[PDB]
Every structure is written in C-alpha cells, then in structure tokens.
C-alpha cells in the first residue's frame, strides 16, 4: 500500500457513497472499503505496526490529499459513514494537521485556498449525529496560530449563541468549548476581535447571563471574568465596566437561586467596585444603592474562609463603596 | 428542555457509587442506569463532569457499557448508560465461587474491553469484581463508569479517586508516572478476587495496605488452581509495569486459551444467582 491505495480509495469508495439509493451491493460492501482504507490510514499516519509515526512514508502521501477538494465534499455529508470510521477521519485530519516543514506546516499553507472547508465543520452543529466530531477536528486546528484568524472574523461566527443553547447538553456543551478556544487560544489574536464588534457581540452575549439553564448561564458568567483580567483585553474590559447596565444586571446575580451563580457573579462585580477611573453611570448607580449593599456584603458567603482573599476582598468592597463619596 | 424527570423514570437504587438508579426511558420502555450528579454540590468544576462524558461517548465497544447520553433538570444532570440485567461479578459471587473456566470466560471478555480501550489511549483506572458487569444472557462487560483518557489524572479532588488501595498498582500508589500497564495490574487484583472472593489483605486496615503494596512482593494464588491460572497471574502481579503483558498478550497466554468457554454458558451462574437469592 502506498499512495497506490489513496487513489483506489478516494475515487472508487468515497466518491461514490453521496450517491446511493438502498442497494445491496452499497449496503456494507461498498462502505467497507470506504472504512478498511481509513484504518489503511492510521497504520501508515501514526504508528507503523509496531515502530513510529513514519517521517519516510508521508512525503510522497501528504501532497496527494490535496488533489482536488478530496476533504471537501468528504465533510459535506457524515452519519452514512462509520462510527469507528468518523473517530479516524478525526484523526486523520488531526495528525497531518501537525506536518511541518521548516517551521510553518504544509497544512495551513494548503488549507487557505478556498477556506469554505472550515464552514463545513461548525455547520455540522445541528446533525445531532456527527456535531462532536466536527468540534473535535474544529479545536485542533483553531490551535494553530495563523488557522483560527480565519473563523474568528466570520459573519456565521455569530451563529454560537443559538448552538449554545441547543437542547442536548452534550453538544450545547461542546459547542461552548470552541466558542472558548477561539477567544482565548490566542490572546493577541483574540483581543483583535472584541473592540471591532463590541456593540453586536456583548449584546449576543448578555442573552446567554439571562438563559437558565443552570450550567449555559455558569459558564458564560465564569468565562466573562477570565476575558476581563486577561489583560490583552484591558482595553475591553474599561469599556465593558462603564456601561451601568451590566453592573445592574450583576447585582441580581447575587440574589440567585444558586450559591455557585452568586459567587461566580461577585467575580464581574467587583471588577466594577476596583476601576481606579470610575465613570459616572457606575458611580451614581453604586452611590444610589451604597446604603444596602453594605448590608449585603456583610452577610455574603460567610463560611468560606477558607479564603482570606474572598474576605480581603470583601471588606475592600465596603471601603470603595462606603468611602464614595 | 427536555424535562429528564418525565422522559425516563427511576426505579430502585442499584449501585451506590453517587446515586445511579435502575429506570425507563419512558418513550421506549428500553431499561437504563440513570446517576443523578448533583452539580451544585460537584464541586470539581463542570468541565471535569463535561470532561468524563465526553471520554464515554468517544467508547463504543460491545465490552464497555454504553452511554446513551445526558440531560440536565434544573442543576440536576442525569446521565443515562446500557443497564445490565445480570448485575456485578461481585454479586454473582454471592451465590457461590466460580469455575476456573467461568474466570476465564470473564478474563478472555474483559480483556477484549481492555484491548479496546488501550488501543485508544485510554485507561479504565477502577478495575475489581465490582464493575464487572453481566447481562441477562451472560456477556460480560466493564462498567464504563472507570474510563479515563491517559492524560491530566484521574483521582484529583472527588467523583474521580480510587476509595480501596486493595486494587491499585505499586506505580500508582508511589504517584509516579503509571500508564496502561497499571490496568493490567488490576486485572490481576480481580483475578484473585474472582478466584479467592475478595482482593488480598482485605483483612487489613487500608492505610497500612497501601504501604505495603510497593514494599512486598506481589500477592499470587494460592490453593486448588492449574498452574496456568496461578501463572496467568504472575504474568500480571509483576511488579516492573513494562514487565507485565499488554492486553492482547494476555489473551494468548495459556490460562485463557485452555479455559475460556461460549460467553452464552455464563447464564449458569445469572440462572443460579436467581435461584439462591430471595427478593
Ligand atoms: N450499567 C450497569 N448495569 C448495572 N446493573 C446492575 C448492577 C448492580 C445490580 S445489584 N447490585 O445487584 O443491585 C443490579 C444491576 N450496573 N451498572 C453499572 S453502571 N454499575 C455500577 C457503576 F457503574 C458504578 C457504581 C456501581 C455500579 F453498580
């Protein structure tokens, strides 16, 4: 087998699936071929039989992948294929994903052709039946640095808010797992993307704080945190802890059903009570309510000490906010 | 949603390790394992819960117990798995020992669970009598409850650590590195119980086991036992983990090859369980 088997492969087998009525001679036959070559894969990609991922055997291999849009039409149709089958596919993205030359991969520089190959996968979302494997080959190559600048910027970007919130967990978890590796993977790259559209973004955004939902509304709260005090979105988050809008919304968060909502929301709120120039908005609203919240915070999660920089942090709290003005 | 609640419905308990229950997916009348993970308790974040289940849906072998996915009520996640209608090595046991051809039909199956898990890159991590589960017609597969990738720890903080030591390798227990081969060491450990009905020192207080394990040599069968089994053993028990088989070996060696019957002729012992049990 060599690349004598891609081409009696690609041509013969797959090509032909997107086809078929419910014949017999397609019904395993015909899709056994299509799965036995992608094992043929794997042999010859990772470990070969004993030994390692040959560095003799991909050189005249890699090159005839791209030969025409052979992944193309490949991720334009699933569920028909394999279940051990769609698990290699996977991994047989994701380990020539990683083949390098000098230092930049042959990857990268022959995926940014027609790029139409990466809508594909976040596409695949909604078909319950192969969403998770979509994210999973979708994560590894948001991991390389010049790859994720492709999606990021994208109009159907915005399409995350509605998988987030579908129904099965399991991919509205998932789905809130790319959405993270993209504002994040990449700081300098990410924080390119936040000031452009602020204004369509955070509004996408604060839908997500209000659905309950009870993990979705966690994990959200939890991960705007992380992108204020990242510190490539200094600029961000100055702007983001200005508007009284959110720190109202806050506020209520603390009154919540749950103990892990409330406390994970004390972690947005006092990044509006630390702001050093503090704007108007914020400080007439605090001022208005400075009365009560100190009979707030003097009750707040007493038990959890445990952490001295909870409670270090709350009796800060009731200086800025008993202090002003 | 998707209210859980009136899609399925829990019966009695089941297995302790918490909250799984026997229950219905009500649209099928198809009988589930249900737990029940309470989330505002956790405490070990989400992404380690989300992380446990993404792991399952990735096994799809016929040895391993299938997930069959999860829903969420209010800050309840109830996650559903293939209920086995034969109950736990562990329980079969209670009715009376086993044939070393009944151990070996048991092994030659948790093997191939192992194999298929191994070739994965994954680890089961919680290998004793216990999760060994049978069907009503005697296949014999592995409460997929263990399965752990091979990075970034198990045990860590709760839902995730090893209670009983009796089971765990030497390499373990010393925290250092420990990869695949530690199953196997389990393997051993349940073999012994399976022939003997519990691990050994189980007479003794876990802290002083625990000590004991790297510092001893390795427990071995003693008894009424062909040699080929008590070597099989060996073969495991080694306490150099490079020095023990892989998985498929093991499926070669003698012990298994001499001993192993039809998975089917397993129903003799769900039929005499059945037979000795009250209620
Ligand atoms: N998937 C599955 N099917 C079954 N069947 C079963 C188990 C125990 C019993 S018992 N102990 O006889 O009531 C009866 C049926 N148990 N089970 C699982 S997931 N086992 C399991 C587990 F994964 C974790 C803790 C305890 C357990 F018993």
């Known amino acids: 087998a060599s690349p004598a088997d891609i081409v009696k492969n690609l041509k013969e087998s797959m090509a032909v699936l997107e086809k078929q009525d419910i014949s017999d001679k397609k019904a395993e036959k015909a899709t056994e071929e299509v799965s036995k070559n992608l094992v043929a894969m794997k042999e010859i990609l990772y470990g070969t039989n004993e030994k390692e991922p040959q560095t003799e055997a991909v050189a005249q291999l890699a090159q005839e992948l791209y030969n025409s849009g052979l992944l193309s039409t490949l991720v334009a149709d699933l569920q ?13 993205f994701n380990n020539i994903l990683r083949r390098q030359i000098g230092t930049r991969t042959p990857t990268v520089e022959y995926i940014c052709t027609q790029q139409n190959i990466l809508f594909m996968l976040l596409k695949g979302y909604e078909s319950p039946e192969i969403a998770l494997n979509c994210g999973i080959m979708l ?10 600048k492709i999606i990021l910027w994208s109009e159907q970007f915005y399409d995350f808010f509605r998988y987030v919130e579908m129904s099965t967990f399991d991919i509205a978890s998932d789905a809130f797992a790319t959405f993270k590796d993209l504002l994040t993977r990449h700081k300098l790259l990410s924080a390119e993307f936040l000031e452009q559209h602020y204004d369509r973004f955070f509004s996408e955004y604060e839908k997500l704080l209000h659905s309950e939902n009870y993990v979705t509304k966690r994990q959200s709260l939890k991960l705007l945190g992380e992108l204020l005090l990242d510190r490539h979105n200094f600029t961000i988050m100055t702007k983001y802890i200005s508007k009284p809008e959110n720190l109202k919304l806050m506020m209520n968060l603390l009154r919540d059903k749950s103990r892990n909502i409330q406390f994970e929301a ?6 509006f009570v630390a702001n050093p120039n503090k704007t108007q908005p914020i400080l007439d609203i605090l001022l208005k309510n400075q009365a009560k919240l100190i009979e707030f915070l003097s009750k707040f999660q007493n038990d959890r000490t445990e952490d001295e920089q909870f409670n270090d942090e709350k009796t800060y709290l009731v200086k800025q906010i008993r202090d002003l003005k | 949603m998707a209210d859980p ?43 380690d819960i989300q992380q446990e289940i993404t792991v399952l849906s990735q096994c799809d072998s016929s040895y391993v117990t299938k997930y069959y996915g999860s829903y969420l009520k209010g800050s309840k996640l109830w996650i559903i798995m293939e209920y086995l209608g034969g109950g736990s090595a562990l329980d079969l046991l209670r009715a009376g020992p086993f044939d070393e051809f009944q151990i070996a039909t048991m092994l030659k ?8 898990l191994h070739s994965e890159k994954k ?34 903080k709760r839902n995730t650590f090893v209670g009983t030591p009796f089971w765990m390798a030497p390499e373990v227990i010393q925290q250092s590195a420990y990869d695949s081969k530690a199953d196997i ?3 051993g450990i349940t073999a012994i119980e399976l022939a003997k009905g519990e691990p050994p020192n189980s007479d003794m207080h876990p802290m002083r086991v625990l000590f004991l394990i790297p510092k001893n040599n390795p427990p071995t069968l003693v008894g009424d036992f062909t040699k080929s089994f008590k070597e099989f053993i060996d073969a495991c028990l080694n306490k150099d983990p490079s020095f023990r088989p892989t998985a498929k070996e093991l499926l070669k060696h003698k012990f298994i090859v001499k001993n192993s019957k039809k998975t089917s002729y397993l129903t003799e012992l769900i039929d005499r369980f059945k037979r000795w049990k009250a209620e």
């Open chain 1, 80 to 92: 028909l294929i394999d279940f051990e089958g769609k698990k290699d596919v996977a991994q047989i």
């Open chain 2, 185 to 187: 060491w389990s393997l």
């Open chain 1, 266 to 271: 004390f972690h947005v709120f006092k990044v």
């Open chain 1, 139 to 148: 994560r590894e190559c948001i991991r390389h640095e010049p790859l994720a």
């Open chain 2, 109 to 116: 199956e948790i093997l191939k669970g192992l194999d298929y």
């Open chain 2, 123 to 156: 680890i089961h991590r919680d290998i004793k009598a216990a999760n060994v589960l049978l069907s009503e017609q005697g296949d014999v597969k592995l409460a997929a409850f263990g399965v752990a990738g091979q990075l970034t720890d198990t045990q860590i």
């Open chain 2, 5 to 47: 609640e009136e899609l399925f419905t829990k019966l009695e308990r089941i297995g302790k390790g918490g909250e799984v229950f026997k229950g219905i997916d009500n649209r099928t009348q198809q009988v589930v394992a249900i737990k029940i993970i309470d989330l505002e308790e956790a405490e070990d974040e989400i992404e």
